[PDB]
Design a protein around this ligand. Structure first.
Ligand code: NAG
Ligand code: NAG
Ligand code: NAG
Lengths: 451, 451, 451
């Protein structure tokens, strides 16, 4: 009673109605800090191998921070309108680039390593100091790295320093590996426990707090982080997390398959597909449409998506799933004249657009070919099948738990007749196709009528 | 006598006929295991720095496994029909999520670290236990990590534990860095020698055994691996490898370039291109067509490609490489009215579609401009040339060993005449354009005839 | 006086005029070397933990080199014409694959670890030997890893070996993680100081030397490196860096937004957009056009971009930013009949194509909705606004420092009248649309006139 599927043979499409929405309708900034060291150049007249190892670790840190210094930033689906993803994080970083704020933040983070602070620009942020380099470089090496008496026989010193250093070393590596702008953000930028604390300490609802505290595995792919500053003794870098202002809304996915007439002639065929495959999630009384499935992700029953690849479509667009011909909303489709075979993957099955003469088949691992189709839009579930072959592609079927419904109906392609139809339409719709057909009929008849 | 190239001026295209097919026409699952530990909380009243390091390593492992726990997962080229890549691996994982299977798998992997086992779902799988955390956490730290007598003076304990831990630490990092779903799979998911053993021990032919045992460098980009379970004492995760049911078939690549008329007028130009650039590999008596070159990969004379971006086209489509006008198969093309310069790069040459008036040139590193072209498709080889400039782009030419053939012929664009042609066609073909020309001529003449 | 923005309401577009060009109009090869070891199999009858650790490190290296061995390298925007990116690097690698050159390269790098050498093929290349495995495997282990007297009590030996090994271990890892072909190249392929030295040493101008010495953060995304050889005692791999033959030219970005009529009817609407969003950079008296923004990158007021996704367009195309109707250059546009809302992001603002009836709004973080638009092309700046919502998407606006100009003008859509316009045009232009409209008018009138 949570997820299921229904496939309409009326226009040859599948609907997976079980997933629960997770829309990042808000952003959230958090400036993390790591207390650096303006180390004075090391100096030991006389080389012990442990001393050389300590020197090499310090020099590796120095190359890390030199790198960081130099990197301180010194088919429908084509009308969405792109957006500046990194605007908020780099805007906060810019707010930091004003001279005074860094001392304020450092003072606010002197005692603890987590605090809510108000920047110069008014919007409150939450900041961390996860790794402290000043302590373990000042009061653990300098008192024991004296000029001449470089007695560092304790080997484990270098091991502790390396374990407390590799985190920031990978931070600088990722700064230099992703143009200072990376997604996902690795744990060396924010430890998972630190992430849980951040989610628990930020201003969102308790249900959303639990929701985003236990759902890390997708957030990183919906998160971002650019460098802010090394201004004074500290490495400060912003993180951009989501804020689910829309939750607990039942939203679904739409998969598409061509309809065609099935004349024995391989050529002169007429084919129609629904060009609206993607995601529909309900937020504010109208659906949110993601055209390209590369902007949405799946987690069991929670689908996590970013709305910046979304439009808001009227709720009447849902009626395009029952009657594509209704005039309430002009459903979007694409027409073409090429006859070839293929199949598409729904949540619990696959739609075989078996066109031409390819030997399409549905089978299970241990049974083999159990069903053979015949030249047309057909659908098969996942229940007893996990291998559908068309031509030479052998697709698997996701074996999630659900109930499959198959609505019979005469394909609309039957209504469309050849010899008049236009053989080129991708951004077309029902209304546009009908208008063009009426225009062609009027021209043909008036040309004949005038006789 | 292995690879060569031939360029047809009839449609301004190039054909690279040397590569040998490697088609993933089958999938193969393998559930890897690593024997975990539900370590009892460590305890030492009195802190020694080595004990501190041991505790930090144990806590790093504990954060790794906390992450693992929390991440539990339950132009032509637009009609292919996408496919579920992760269906088989997550389906096997789901089979594992049944309570009883993990105990059987563990029992079958108690003695060795490689065995073929039959899951509950029927399809036999092969599993390893590459890394064993239970041993080095049970009988080599606990007996030496007693409550009070935490005598761990031996430093190399931590070194050995870290070297046996970093593998699974990277496993969990990658699980949290790729939504538990990554491609390629890093070696910490399957060591290189373990992978050779896996290939040698699984059910494929001896020739294919040698074949894909020595073809590692590409498989990882055709491999996949999602996390299955942490159920009982073990970390188990699936790996999805290809099964080359089609091999030793000589397959080729198609590169495309626009034909146009060469009127002195920059505007009012008419241009046609072959819109079928991509890969053709022969499997079962008909060719397999990959439209977008981002689904096929190259290594010497053997090309490894994924079939889910493949259609099966009639063998007569090969005839589109000799006579685009042949009525056996309607060759696919695109027509447009924009006149600009460009060039394309085949396996052994470069096609300069020098249009407009850009100064196109063919040159070598130590010579410079050696050939200057003039307003149309010209083609140049790789032999003495490795720098072709058009406008301000300066392309290199792949220097593989081959023999170049250049078929002369009058471009079809000459047959097409202006003043009637439609200036918008991307999914068009020879038959479609001919039918549209029929319609335009009939309308123009009947309009004049009725006078 | 460095960057600003101007938005034309005539065609509903934004121009960001401040960025400075960085065009990779040349390539540069550099073969890096690391002096390997053909280690004789280790042998110690009697197991000490230090000895086992040394053996495990040696075996990890041996698996690294086994991996290396087996991976021996045996909308407008669709007409650009792709190019062989890895041609130069693998061509140099091939030049190395001739038997003798590796000895010359090794000898030329016997004393220092940086030198210019002339390959067999004539084009000079500069090579380093950054990491030396022969020394620390020959004259630091063999004299102290004798058959029986394996007295390696010194623990730090393994630490030094591991720190000098991890670089090449990750080099082989990246060879096997990116099909031997990766971008960006990690620091373990070229230390950042080594990169600065390389830039200071390679043949480019002094201004260009400083220019590419201080700009590492972006270069790696324009760099490439394939495996060349393991021929004799050395691991040699090429690196492919840009050569800015065009610099100090002021170049800009173009952002697009639909124009439409504003009838109360949601259907039967007519819409036009400028289909030329992308990058324009001046190189040789004519502009360079990058259609898809995924081939260009940004840093401060300086844009670093790759030219293989660039065409050379006449300077008159700049006039399409003032008079789209000018006949000098036929400006490229797209027309469609679908009425939906959206917005696009320029360098200092956002263009709201608020169409249909969506509640679009412009707001600041601490102020909220400050501006409400009304059913049409409108534009808003970055100054007092950083939150533009359309429907349910909530975009941020980049807060860079600039001056915003808003040219008023009657949208060209007003001139276009309904009932005759074609509802399908993506690769269309002003001239093509006018020709089609004139054809339709002539047909309608002659049909009526003949009466
Ligand atoms: C002769 C006739 O029936 N003409 C109608 C026309 O009036 C109408 O606008 C169009 C759209 O429904 O369909 C057709
Ligand atoms: C009836 C009519 O509109 N005729 C004009 C024709 O005279 C002109 O040459 C052409 C230019 O594109 O536009 C149209
Ligand atoms: C176009 O030519 C005639 C038009 O009179 C038409 O009958 C024919 O089918 C078309 N194709 C040809 C002639 O190849």
């Amino acid at each position: 009673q949570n997820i299921t599927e229904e496939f309409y043979q009326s226009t040859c499409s599948a609907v997976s109605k079980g997933y629960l929405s997770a829309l990042r309708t808000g952003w959230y900034t958090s400036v993390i800090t790591i207390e650096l060291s303006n180390i004075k150049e090391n100096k030991c007249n006389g080389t012990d191998a442990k001393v050389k190892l300590i020197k090499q670790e310090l020099d590796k840190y120095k190359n890390a921070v030199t790198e960081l210094q130099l990197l301180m930033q010194s088919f429908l689906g084509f009308l969405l309108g792109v957006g500046s993803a990194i605007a908020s994080g780099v805007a906060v970083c810019k707010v930091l680039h004003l001279e005074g704020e860094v001392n304020k933040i450092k003072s606010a983070l002197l005692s603890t390593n987590k605090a809510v602070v108000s920047l110069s620009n008014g919007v409150s942020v939450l900041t961390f100091k996860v790794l402290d380099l000043k302590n373990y470089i000042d009061k653990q090496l300098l008192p024991i790295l004296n000029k001449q008496s470089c007695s560092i026989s304790n080997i484990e010193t270098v091991i502790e320093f390396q374990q407390k250093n590799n985190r920031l070393l990978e931070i600088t590596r990722e700064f230099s590996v992703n143009a200072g702008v990376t997604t996902p953000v690795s744990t060396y930028m924010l430890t998972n426990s630190e992430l849980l604390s951040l989610i628990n300490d930020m201003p969102i609802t308790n249900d959303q707090k639990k929701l985003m505290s236990n759902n890390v595995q997708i957030v990183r792919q919906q998160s971002y982080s650019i460098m802010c500053i090394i201004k004074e003794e500290v490495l400060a870098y912003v993180v951009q997390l989501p804020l689910y202002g829309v939750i607990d809304t039942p939203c679904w996915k739409l998969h598409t398959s061509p309809l065609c007439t099935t004349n024995t002639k391989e050529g002169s065929n007429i084919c129609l597909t629904r060009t609206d495959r993607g995601w529909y999630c309900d937020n504010a009384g109208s659906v949110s449409f993601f055209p390209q499935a590369e902007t949405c992700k799946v987690q069991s029953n929670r689908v996590f998506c970013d709305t910046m690849n979304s439009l808001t479509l009227p709720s009447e667009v849902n009626l395009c799933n029952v009657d594509i011909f209704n005039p309430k909303y002009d459903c979007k489709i694409m027409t073409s004249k090429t006859d070839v075979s293929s199949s598409v993957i729904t949540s619990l099955g696959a739609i075989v657009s078996c066109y031409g003469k390819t030997k399409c088949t549905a089978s299970n691992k241990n049974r083999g070919i159990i069903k053979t189709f015949s030249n047309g839009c057909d659908y098969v579930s996942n229940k007893g099948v996990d291998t559908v072959s068309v031509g030479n592609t052998l697709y698997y079927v996701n074996k999630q738990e659900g109930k499959s419904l198959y609505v019979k109906g005469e394909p609309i392609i039957n209504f469309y007749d050849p010899l008049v139809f236009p053989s080129d339409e991708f951004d077309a719709s029902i209304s546009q196709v009908n208008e063009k057909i009426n225009q062609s009929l009027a021209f043909i008849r008036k040309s004949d009528e005038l006789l």
